[PDB]
């Protein structure tokens, strides 16, 4: 018998009980910053067809920078 | 946050002279604090006289020094450097009077003193004097003025000021007082200073525990009130 | 390591602090002198061309030393200022003592003598500024002199310092003209090299400074070209460049 | 939106101040104002607590040394 | 108990309000609508009793207590300094509620070298552990320091170890209470002139009074056995003055 | 660069005088001050915001004169600024005693920067960690110069040092037109400090010095209050 792999929380992959509980509406403003982040790390996972329809691979990395807090 | 520090002439990467910073933290080593408050027509300074023995000659324990007949100062910091600053200020005031023909305004006094302390900050020859000068005096056409001027060489005019271990608490209490504007008469000024030191120290202030110096426009002369006078002032504060 | 003081000799015999001062000229501005008979020029560059910079001097990189001497500068601003002050003082001292203009080389020798002294005595950072010299004298006429923060100097016909110095000198060698170096050709060559050694193209007139020295009726008029003549010079270079594309 | 604010607490007079307070500073201003209201056993945050807390999160200088300015 | 530490009534009350309230009655904080505060910063002269205060809170709350010397956690080898904080916090996750009392932070809290950037890295690890991702948790920290100006401003935030409690050297009236609590257990039928001892003990710290009591007991041990005379307290104070310097 | 940042007389392998850069960083962490050059004159403004109400705001002035036609402003070490202003006044008086004409702005700034360079050439003396903005009315054209601890004097038309200086320059190049006058130069200068000054603009918090045809003069609080009520 081959057993399914065991990599559930090897390096602290967020489990179903470790959700941050922070809604998008909970955070204030950041509309442009939300849209840019949502456009590289959330949108490609769901709507990959729309990305492939233009001929661009979705951006793979984002860097949020600014003053602390 | 030690930084480069070790040489006073060496700037930190962020641009702060760490060695000059430690002079301020050397100021409050003496365990005493002095409070100055400017009234409508007078300026008063109250300091801590903590004689930790019965053998000390209480006459020479004074932190108040008379630089000139019209301007007096109180010391908060290391005693030796404070005395050295007193000696330098006396020479500076005498030189001003001999060179320009009239007594030195209190502002120019440790403008010059802070200028001397600033050269000590730049040139790596003299270790900076770890003590603050609080100067009072009646100058004509501007009335009483109070000047607190630090080892780093920054001088400014204070409606009231305090330096020592209990410096932040005292200046906060003054923040509370000077704002609810009232008639800052001489008795009110002395009361404000006494309340400052008492509230920050929570001490009943036995009359041998403090030294108050008064300069008033009516008699522009540096005077240190004797024990009986400060006892009467403390009683008037009580009721 | 042996770069703690300017007076420390490395085990290989190399003054590391000096060479650190030498290589630091790469951060200095681009100033070049082209080959030219009956004239000579320097072509400087203005890095700080921000619009909020009011212009009052028009010679921030071009300095006049004597009535017949002009020098550029490439290095630390304060060092360049004190060095040019000493330059003018030495030139005027020679003029007072001999009642004759300094003969070019002896002024450059004076600066290099002063400069090397900082590289020998301790407690003084070596002067990290190299500067071209132009001038005329009754001995050798027009000359171009290369100062170097080590106190080493040298006669030159075409050289440059600062950013992209190697590219500028290589390009000056590519079209190096001996003898047939008229002032118009020298100006054209200066603009042509400045077009490439400067990263920004089109060579805007306000960002390029040319100073020329010519012998006119025994007066040695030192000229700094205004915006109009620099504009027409870059226009001439642009029209010449248009013809070069006919090969394709 | 989740905090219990008195009707007299007008948030606009604090957002119009020119101080460059960060989002973390804004959350500090809110949480410490609520804490101050809690200290007095009051279950409603008043404008006085908001003004008092507003002064304690924007005075970041405090110590300084008066000679760097 | 909280009565064991004497003369910090105001500071004791602020620490109770900061830490005891979110762990005992969070209903007030959730009714107001604010996330419960976590962390209190006790600063003062060394030996004044901040650790005793932390133990008193951890005893009244009947919760597990972690005491750590912050100066010990900064190890020469890279990454172990932040690793210790990481293990500490993940440890507090399993055993809840937790009082994470950290000692003098000036080593950790408050630049061109690897060893200096190590302190930066462990500082970022600390601030991430207190306020940030994973679980915001309910454990509390009694992180205490000796020099408050050195502390990083970011280390002073509401959900990030707010409330700078000042614990100065034992107050003038506090000396009497401290001597009452630490000398009362010691058998002593003779009357006490406590004011004289307090005046003879100026600049003393809380531990010094306990050493005075223990050493007075020692003087009694080297003698009859019963504490009867004030001269013993005088010489105890002097030897806890000159020999403890 | 890492171990050579201490000494000011030691070149880094890239030849960077790191101590001067650290002094300039100290300059960039000072109180924001702005000066702009109008076709009518030069206006300099700074924020003298005390840490408490306890201070006498009129005691120490930041916008200060050298001669009747030249004023100074700074963003950095005030104690270092005082010695600088003293030496600048001495140098101007020395020029007046020899040439009998008032110091031109260019020359005065050159010798002040030379004084600055004197403290950045040997070990044991620290660079003057303040940057100075200098005005002047002479030979019928206004001047505005900035001198840094490095000794490099510029010819700024309009600039601002201190905290949030980048945002201050960003405000400029937007509402700064060359053909303006002094009266709106005051309004522009007050606006520039507004993007950095954290608090209400009260008459004893912003000190402005106009450097006009008649000469440089520090504005009294009443006129500053008038302009501040006009802008607000
Ligand atoms: N204010 C105080 N009241 C009573 N005992 C004290 C006080 N301060 C210190 N002590 C005694 O000193 C001992 C150690 O003090 P400690 O908590 O280490 O001080 P700190 O936390 O300032 O280092 C404790 O066992 C305690 O009995």
């Amino acid at each position: 018998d081959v057993l399914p792999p065991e990599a559930d929380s090897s390096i602290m992959m967020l489990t179903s009980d470790q959700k941050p509980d922070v809604m998008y509406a909970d955070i204030g403003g950041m509309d442009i910053q939300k849209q840019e982040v949502r456009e590289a790390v959330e949108l490609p996972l769901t709507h990959f067809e729309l990305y492939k329809q233009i001929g661009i691979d979705p951006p793979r990395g984002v860097l949020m920078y600014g003053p602390p807090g | 946050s030690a930084g480069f520090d070790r040489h006073i002439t060496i700037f930190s990467p962020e641009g702060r002279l760490y060695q000059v910073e430690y002079a301020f933290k050397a100021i409050n080593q003496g365990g005493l604090t002095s409070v100055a408050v400017r009234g409508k027509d007078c300026a008063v300074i109250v300091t801590q006289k903590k004689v930790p023995d019965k053998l000390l000659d209480s006459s020479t324990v004074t932190h108040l020094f008379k630089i000139t007949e019209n301007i007096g100062c109180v010391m908060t910091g290391m005693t030796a450097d404070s005395r050295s600053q007193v000696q330098r200020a006396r020479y500076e005031a005498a030189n001003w009077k001999y060179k320009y023909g009239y007594e030195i305004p209190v502002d120019m006094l440790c403008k010059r003193i802070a200028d001397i302390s600033q050269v000590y900050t730049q040139n790596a020859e003299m270790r900076p004097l770890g003590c603050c000068m609080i100067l009072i005096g009646i100058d004509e056409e501007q009335g009483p003025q109070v000047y607190k001027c630090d080892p780093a060489g920054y001088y400014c005019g204070f409606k009231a000021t305090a330096a020592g271990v209990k410096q932040t608490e005292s200046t906060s209490f003054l923040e509370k007082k000077v704002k609810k504007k009232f008639d800052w008469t001489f008795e009110q000024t002395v009361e404000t200073a006494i309340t400052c030191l008492s509230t920050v120290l929570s001490i009943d202030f036995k009359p041998s525990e403090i030294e108050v110096g008064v300069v008033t426009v009516e008699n522009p002369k540096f005077r240190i009130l004797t024990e009986a006078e400060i006892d009467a002032h403390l009683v008037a504060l009580a009721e | 390591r042996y770069d703690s003081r300017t007076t420390i000799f490395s085990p290989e015999g190399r003054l590391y602090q000096v060479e650190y001062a030498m290589e630091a000229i790469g951060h200095a501005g681009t100033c070049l002198g082209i080959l030219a008979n009956d004239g000579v020029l320097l072509a400087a560059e203005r890095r700080n061309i921000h619009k909020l910079l009011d212009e009052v001097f028009f010679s921030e990189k071009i300095y006049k030393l004597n009535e017949d001497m002009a020098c550029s500068v490439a290095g630390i601003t304060s060092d360049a200022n004190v060095l040019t002050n000493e330059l003018r003082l030495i030139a005027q001292r020679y003029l007072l003592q001999y009642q004759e203009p300094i003969p070019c080389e002896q002024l450059v020798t004076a600066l290099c003598d002063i400069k090397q002294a900082y590289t020998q005595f301790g407690g003084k950072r070596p002067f990290g500024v190299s500067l071209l010299y132009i001038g005329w004298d009754k001995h050798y006429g027009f000359q171009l002199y290369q100062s170097d923060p080590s106190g080493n100097y040298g006669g030159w016909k075409a050289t440059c310092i600062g950013n992209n110095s190697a590219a500028a000198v290589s390009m000056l060698k590519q079209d190096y003209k001996e003898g047939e170096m008229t002032l118009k050709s020298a100006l054209a060559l200066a603009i042509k090299v400045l077009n490439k050694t400067m990263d920004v193209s089109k060579l805007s007139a306000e960002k390029v400074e040319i100073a020329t020295l010519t012998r006119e009726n025994g007066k040695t008029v030192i000229r700094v070209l205004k915006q109009k003549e620099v504009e027409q010079l870059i226009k001439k270079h642009e029209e010449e460049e248009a013809k070069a594309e006919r090969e394709k | 939106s989740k905090m219990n604010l008195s009707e007299e607490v007008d948030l606009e007079d604090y957002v119009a101040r020119p101080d460059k307070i960060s989002g973390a500073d804004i959350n500090s201003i809110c949480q410490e104002s609520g804490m101050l209201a809690v200290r007095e056993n009051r279950y409603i945050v008043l404008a006085k607590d908001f003004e008092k807390a507003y002064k304690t999160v924007i005075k970041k200088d405090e110590q300084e040394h008066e000679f760097y300015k | 108990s909280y009565s064991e530490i004497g003369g910090l009534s105001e500071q004791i009350r602020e620490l109770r309000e900061v830490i005891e309230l979110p762990l005992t009655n969070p209903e007030l904080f959730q009714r107001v609508g604010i996330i419960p505060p976590k962390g209190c910063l006790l600063y003062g002269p060394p030996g004044t009793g901040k650790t005793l205060l932390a133990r008193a809170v951890a005893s009244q709350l009947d919760c597990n207590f972690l005491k750590v010397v912050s100066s010990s956690i900064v190890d020469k080898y890279i990454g172990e300094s932040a690793r210790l904080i990481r293990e500490m916090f993940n440890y507090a996750r399993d055993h809840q509620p937790c009082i994470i009392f950290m000692d003098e932070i000036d080593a950790i809290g408050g630049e061109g070298t690897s060893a200096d950037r190590e302190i930066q890295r462990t500082l970022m690890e600390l601030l991430n552990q207190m306020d940030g991702f994973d679980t915001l948790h309910r454990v509390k920290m009694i992180m205490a320091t000796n020099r408050p100006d050195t502390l990083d401003p970011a280390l002073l935030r509401p959900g990030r170890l707010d409330r700078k409690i000042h614990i100065d050297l034992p107050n003038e009236q506090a000396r009497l209470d401290i001597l009452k609590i630490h000398a009362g257990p010691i058998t002593k039928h003779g009357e006490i002139d406590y004011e004289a001892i307090v005046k003879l003990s100026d600049g003393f710290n809380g531990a010094d009074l306990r050493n005075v009591c223990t050493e007075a007991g020692m003087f009694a041990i080297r003698a009859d056995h019963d504490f009867v005379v004030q001269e013993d307290f005088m010489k105890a104070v002097r030897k806890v003055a000159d020999s403890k310097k | 660069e890492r171990g050579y940042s201490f000494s000011l007389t030691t070149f880094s392998p890239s030849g960077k005088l790191v101590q001067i850069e650290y002094a300039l960083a100290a300059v960039a962490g000072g109180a924001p001050s702005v000066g702009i050059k109008a076709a009518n004159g030069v206006v300099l403004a700074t924020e003298k915001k005390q840490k408490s109400i306890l201070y006498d705001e009129r005691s120490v002035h930041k916008v200060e004169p050298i001669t009747k036609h030249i004023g100074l402003v700074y963003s950095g070490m005030g104690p270092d600024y005082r010695v600088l202003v003293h030496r600048a006044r001495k140098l101007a008086q020395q020029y007046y005693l020899v040439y009998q004409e008032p110091i031109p702005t260019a020359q005065l700034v050159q010798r002040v920067a030379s004084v600055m360079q004197e403290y950045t050439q040997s070990g044991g003396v620290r660079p003057f960690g303040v940057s100075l903005l200098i005005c002047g009315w002479n030979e019928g054209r206004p001047y505005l110069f900035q001198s840094d601890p490095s000794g490099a004097y510029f010819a700024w038309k309009a600039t601002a040092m201190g905290k949030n200086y980048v945002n201050g320059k960003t405000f400029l190049e937007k509402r700064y037109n060359e053909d303006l006058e002094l009266e709106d130069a005051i309004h522009t200068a007050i606006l520039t400090l507004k993007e950095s000054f954290e608090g209400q603009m009260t008459e004893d918090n912003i000190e402005v010095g106009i450097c006009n045809e008649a000469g440089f003069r520090r504005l009294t609080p009443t006129e500053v209050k008038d302009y501040l009520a006009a802008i607000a």
Side-chain angles (χ1 to χ4, degrees), chain A, chain B residues 1-39 42-49 51-53 55-57 59-140 142-180 184-190 192-217 219-239, chain C residues 1-9 11-33 35-47 50 52-173 175-180 182-190 192-197 199-201 203-206 208-218 220-225 229-246, chain D, chain E, chain F:
Chain A
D1 191 318
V2 84
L3 281 191
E6 47 279 342
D8 58 344
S9 301
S10 174
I11 324 287
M12 291 325 88
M13 203 167 29
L14 277 184
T15 37
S16 325
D17 274 28
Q18 270 158 349
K19 227 70 172 192
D21 166 285
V22 165
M23 292 283 326
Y24 267 113
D26 288 5
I27 87 181
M30 263 178 300
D31 35 48
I32 312 181
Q33 295 81 357
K34 277 157 45 174
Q35 192 200 41
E36 306 287 89
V37 153
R38 278 156 78 103
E39 219 170 66
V41 317
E42 145 188 347
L43 207 185
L45 321 183
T46 87
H47 297 72
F48 200 12
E49 318 98 41
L50 194 32
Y51 271 96
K52 189 222 161 173
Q53 213 183 339
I54 312 140
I56 64 196
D57 35 17
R60 284 176 329 171
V62 313
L63 174 78
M64 320 171 285
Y65 70 82
Chain B
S1 76
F4 295 171
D5 159 52
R6 272 91 173 271
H7 303 111
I8 182 171
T9 326
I10 290 330
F11 256 123
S12 69
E14 36 261 30
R16 64 211 321 271
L17 311 163
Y18 266 128
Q19 180 67 197
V20 194
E21 302 276 80
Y22 301 125
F24 292 75
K25 274 182 321 203
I27 285 168
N28 48 358
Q29 75 73 23
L32 321 178
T33 166
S34 325
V35 183
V37 47
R38 217 180 71 209
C42 83
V44 84
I45 52 191
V46 50
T47 172
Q48 227 166 266
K49 176 146 157 179
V51 182
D53 80 51
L55 294 172
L56 214 50
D57 193 338
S59 89
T60 53
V61 160
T62 171
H63 270 39
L64 302 157
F65 308 92
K66 159 175 208 283
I67 327 163
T68 308
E69 314 214 20
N70 286 294
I71 39 185
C73 82
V74 70
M75 280 330 176
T76 285
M78 281 175 328
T79 300
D81 309 18
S82 65
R83 209 98 48 72
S84 161
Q85 213 154 30
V86 150
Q87 207 92 20
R88 199 42 201 280
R90 295 211 246 243
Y91 179 86
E92 269 316 313
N95 234 308
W96 163 281
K97 193 178 186 315
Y98 169 83
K99 269 188 42 164
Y100 313 102
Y102 62 100
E103 307 233 8
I104 177 149
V106 56
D107 67 21
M108 311 305 218
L109 189 55
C110 71
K111 159 186 292 316
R112 205 66 86 72
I113 273 298
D115 282 358
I116 316 304
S117 211
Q118 190 275 341
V119 179
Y120 293 358
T121 285
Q122 284 205 220
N123 303 57
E125 154 97 347
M126 181 86 48
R127 180 207 84 211
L129 298 176
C131 41
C132 269
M133 250 196 196
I134 330 170
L135 280 163
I136 64 182
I138 308 310
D139 290 324
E140 298 285 40
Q142 320 76 39
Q145 335 174 289
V146 164
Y147 281 102
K148 167 169 142 72
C149 52
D150 37 357
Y154 162 97
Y155 81 107
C156 196
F158 296 78
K159 303 172 160 113
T161 175
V165 186
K166 302 281 153 44
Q167 144 161 40
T168 67
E169 309 82 335
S170 41
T171 198
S172 306
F173 165 20
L174 291 325
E175 249 153 18
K176 295 213 299 276
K177 203 55 53 184
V178 48
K179 240 160 189 182
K180 32 181 57 53
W184 288 98
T185 90
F186 155 73
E187 48 171 61
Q188 312 294 310
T189 321
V190 166
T192 312
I194 283 296
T195 48
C196 215
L197 213 32
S198 35
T199 53
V200 314
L201 312 175
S202 97
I203 303 313
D204 312 0
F205 272 144
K206 214 172 279 211
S208 69
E209 305 211 292
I210 34 164
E211 335 180 48
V212 288
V214 175
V215 176
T216 322
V217 61
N219 51 352
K221 172 73 69 62
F222 189 59
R223 177 195 353 142
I224 291 175
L225 323 180
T226 60
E227 183 103 349
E229 317 160 27
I230 91 162
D231 246 355
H233 265 291
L234 282 182
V235 152
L237 259 304
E239 313 54 60
Chain C
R1 230 173 317 98
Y2 305 86
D3 41 308
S4 53
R5 324 186 270 112
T6 169
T7 69
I8 271 294
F9 261 119
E12 287 47 50
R14 320 213 273 111
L15 297 175
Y16 272 142
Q17 264 295 313
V18 169
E19 318 177 346
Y20 286 8
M22 313 267 269
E23 293 211 39
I25 304 288
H27 312 357
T30 280
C31 34
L32 73 102
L35 317 101
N37 47 344
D38 63 34
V40 69
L41 57 89
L42 330 170
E45 213 76 350
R46 303 149 159 269
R47 310 231 266 265
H50 193 266
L52 292 191
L53 279 207
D54 175 357
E55 221 303 325
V56 62
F57 309 112
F58 307 85
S59 57
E60 75 303 344
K61 277 264 285 199
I62 281 297
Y63 290 119
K64 79 171 310 203
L65 329 182
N66 214 357
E67 77 248 8
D68 89 7
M69 301 275 308
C71 96
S72 99
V73 272
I76 303 108
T77 315
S78 59
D79 296 16
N81 296 13
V82 53
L83 226 54
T84 203
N85 277 17
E86 193 52 42
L87 256 192
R88 276 153 192 179
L89 214 154
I90 290 179
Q92 218 75 354
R93 280 207 267 238
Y94 189 101
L95 176 50
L96 186 159
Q97 206 217 331
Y98 284 26
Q99 313 281 28
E100 219 186 12
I102 207 145
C104 277
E105 172 134 30
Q106 301 154 235
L107 186 52
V108 178
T109 298
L111 224 37
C112 285
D113 273 13
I114 275 277
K115 218 191 312 313
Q116 184 274 300
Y118 276 30
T119 69
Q120 197 142 10
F121 304 139
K124 296 179 296 231
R125 151 182 67 92
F127 266 114
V129 45
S130 68
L131 54 160
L132 279 285
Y133 313 85
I134 43 188
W136 178 94
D137 58 9
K138 40 179 259 312
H139 292 269
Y140 318 93
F142 309 82
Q143 314 161 57
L144 189 45
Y145 276 147
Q146 173 84 340
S147 188
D148 163 358
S150 74
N152 281 286
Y153 76 104
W156 280 107
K157 296 137 177 265
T159 172
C160 188
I161 51 192
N163 61 321
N164 285 107
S165 311
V169 69
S170 72
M171 158 155 210
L172 255 63
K173 250 302 157 180
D175 89 9
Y176 146 80
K177 33 152 188 69
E178 66 284 16
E180 39 274 28
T182 181
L183 215 34
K184 296 188 170 21
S185 67
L187 284 153
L189 151 68
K192 180 212 186 33
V193 56
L194 281 191
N195 215 124
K196 140 187 305 163
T197 177
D199 53 305
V200 280
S201 179
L203 225 49
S204 98
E206 59 87 15
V208 160
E209 173 155 358
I210 272 52
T212 58
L213 166 138
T214 326
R215 282 296 279 155
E216 264 164 30
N217 177 217
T220 316
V221 44
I222 271 161
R223 297 259 321 287
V224 316
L225 319 186
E229 41 264 29
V230 175
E231 258 296 353
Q232 66 84 25
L233 210 63
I234 61 141
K235 196 267 283 180
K236 159 53 190 194
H237 180 271
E238 197 52 279
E239 311 321 306
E240 193 291 347
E241 180 44 43
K243 164 62 191 174
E245 289 150 290
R246 298 293 173 271
Chain D
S1 66
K2 47 204 161 192
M3 273 198 346
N4 178 24
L5 281 197
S6 175
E7 184 60 45
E8 63 156 50
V9 171
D10 158 11
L11 283 182
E12 178 85 351
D13 43 48
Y14 315 124
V15 311
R17 316 286 183 81
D19 319 69
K20 304 163 213 92
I21 46 178
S22 86
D25 303 358
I26 292 283
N27 176 65
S28 177
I29 296 190
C30 282
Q31 297 299 322
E32 152 76 0
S33 100
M35 258 212 77
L36 248 172
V38 162
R39 184 191 320 302
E40 315 204 50
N41 313 317
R42 188 171 43 264
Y43 64 125
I44 298 139
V45 171
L46 286 173
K48 49 177 56 64
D49 325 290
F50 248 93
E51 258 287 356
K52 176 149 197 214
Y54 185 51
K55 191 175 142 91
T56 205
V57 201
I58 83 171
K59 290 164 65 19
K60 154 260 317 189
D61 48 342
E62 293 187 327
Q63 292 325 330
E64 303 302 272
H65 266 105
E66 314 180 316
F67 76 87
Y68 297 115
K69 329 177 137 83
Chain E
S1 98
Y2 298 122
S3 99
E4 316 314 285
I5 347 106
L8 317 85
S9 295
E10 324 292 351
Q11 315 136 68
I12 292 169
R13 206 225 70 260
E14 325 180 11
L15 178 65
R16 312 279 300 299
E17 192 265 319
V18 152
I19 284 177
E20 162 267 341
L21 284 198
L23 272 189
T24 57
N25 32 22
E27 82 281 332
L28 322 153
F29 287 150
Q30 61 83 6
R31 183 158 62 261
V32 163
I34 51 183
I35 163 174
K38 50 204 190 93
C40 154
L41 167 64
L42 307 161
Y43 64 90
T48 316
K50 295 167 298 312
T51 314
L52 179 55
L53 201 71
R55 311 189 329 178
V57 181
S59 316
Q60 187 71 343
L61 301 193
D62 321 292
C63 84
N64 21 276
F65 169 78
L66 274 63
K67 171 203 48 168
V68 49
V69 202
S70 315
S71 75
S72 80
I73 89 177
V74 44
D75 167 16
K76 179 183 76 100
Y77 314 111
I78 275 163
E80 219 184 310
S81 46
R83 198 187 57 67
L84 292 177
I85 287 135
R86 196 167 329 110
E87 313 287 6
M88 180 178 282
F89 273 85
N90 319 295
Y91 194 59
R93 309 319 194 114
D94 325 287
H95 326 62
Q96 282 205 49
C98 209
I99 287 316
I100 314 189
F101 164 89
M102 221 175 278
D103 223 28
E104 327 147 52
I105 288 204
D106 36 359
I108 288 321
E111 317 301 297
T113 165
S114 178
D116 170 312
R117 290 198 323 233
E118 178 53 40
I119 93 164
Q120 266 288 347
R121 289 198 208 76
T122 176
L123 181 76
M124 321 165 98
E125 176 74 351
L126 186 59
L127 328 166
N128 157 295
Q129 291 306 331
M130 330 173 33
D131 174 20
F133 217 132
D134 40 290
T135 306
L136 301 83
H137 71 200
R138 86 202 211 171
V139 315
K140 301 299 177 287
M141 40 231 73
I142 294 207
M143 313 213 179
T145 186
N146 225 8
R147 324 151 190 150
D149 40 337
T150 285
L151 270 289
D152 190 49
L155 201 143
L156 188 69
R157 285 221 301 101
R160 213 185 231 142
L161 183 43
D162 56 304
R163 164 70 30 81
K164 304 185 35 131
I165 299 194
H166 185 356
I167 299 185
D168 36 15
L169 268 200
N171 300 340
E172 161 46 10
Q173 272 97 351
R175 262 84 72 63
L176 151 74
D177 203 58
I178 287 171
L179 295 181
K180 292 301 313 182
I181 166 62
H182 266 300
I186 281 308
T187 65
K188 48 101 150 193
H189 31 64
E191 188 214 82
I192 304 291
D193 46 33
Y194 275 124
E195 299 171 353
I197 297 150
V198 171
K199 291 308 292 185
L200 286 167
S201 100
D202 289 344
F204 265 43
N205 82 79
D208 294 352
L209 292 320
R210 103 178 172 173
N211 318 127
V212 174
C213 305
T214 325
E215 202 173 68
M218 212 65 244
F219 292 124
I221 294 306
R222 321 178 200 282
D224 42 330
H225 82 104
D226 47 293
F227 201 165
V228 79
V229 69
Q230 292 314 80
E231 163 63 354
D232 190 318
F233 254 121
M234 257 55 93
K235 69 176 147 274
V237 153
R238 301 177 269 259
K239 161 172 331 172
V240 177
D242 62 2
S243 86
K244 304 262 161 183
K245 162 66 64 64
Chain F
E1 285 54 37
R2 291 63 173 210
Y4 319 156
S5 85
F6 297 82
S7 195
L8 56 166
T9 47
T10 317
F11 272 121
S12 62
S14 40
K16 275 202 202 54
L17 282 164
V18 184
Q19 199 75 193
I20 279 170
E21 273 164 29
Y22 288 168
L24 281 177
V27 152
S33 76
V34 55
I36 87 163
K37 166 177 140 273
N40 180 324
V42 198
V43 152
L44 302 94
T46 183
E47 59 94 359
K48 196 218 311 303
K49 172 164 48 50
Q50 316 290 8
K51 268 150 81 73
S52 308
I53 188 43
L54 269 298
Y55 292 49
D56 176 303
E57 321 81 18
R58 264 161 291 300
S59 174
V60 154
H61 313 76
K62 289 175 97 144
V63 152
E64 291 262 270
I66 303 306
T67 80
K68 214 172 281 213
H69 63 287
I70 278 155
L72 302 206
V73 88
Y74 72 101
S75 321
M77 312 215 68
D80 297 46
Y81 171 66
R82 295 199 324 271
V83 157
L84 222 33
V85 85
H86 174 40
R87 310 283 318 282
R89 281 164 174 165
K90 291 201 65 36
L91 288 208
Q93 270 170 356
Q94 267 150 13
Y95 180 88
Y96 184 63
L97 274 175
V98 180
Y99 285 41
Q100 283 292 3
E101 285 77 72
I103 196 66
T105 324
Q107 294 296 334
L108 177 71
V109 181
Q110 288 163 340
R111 334 200 184 201
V112 170
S114 153
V115 154
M116 312 264 263
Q117 181 267 349
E118 154 174 332
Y119 292 70
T120 88
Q121 59 174 331
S122 73
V125 317
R126 165 185 89 260
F128 268 113
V130 307
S131 266
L132 295 198
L133 249 69
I134 299 143
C135 94
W137 188 224
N138 52 5
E139 323 82 18
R141 74 141 291 181
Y143 292 124
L144 179 49
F145 289 62
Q146 183 198 359
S147 187
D148 50 355
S150 98
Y153 57 101
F154 334 114
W156 270 136
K157 215 188 307 280
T159 186
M161 324 145 295
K163 288 183 185 104
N164 274 257
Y165 70 118
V166 280
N167 154 253
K169 309 271 290 302
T170 305
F171 180 26
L172 311 193
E173 270 275 299
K174 281 195 197 178
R175 314 261 171 271
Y176 180 39
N177 96 76
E178 174 42 43
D179 204 354
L180 81 175
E181 207 230 13
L182 195 62
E183 71 89 30
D184 53 327
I186 289 265
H187 283 67
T188 311
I190 275 145
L191 266 179
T192 295
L193 291 181
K194 191 136 194 42
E195 285 101 9
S196 310
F197 186 96
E198 308 91 331
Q200 69 283 30
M201 223 75 87
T202 280
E203 86 163 2
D204 53 8
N205 259 336
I206 291 297
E207 301 56 6
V208 181
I210 75 196
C211 162
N212 58 48
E213 281 50 35
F216 168 86
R217 46 169 292 264
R218 186 198 313 109
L219 293 211
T220 191
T222 74
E223 305 166 38
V224 160
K225 173 181 156 8
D226 273 348
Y227 293 114
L228 256 184
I231 170 149

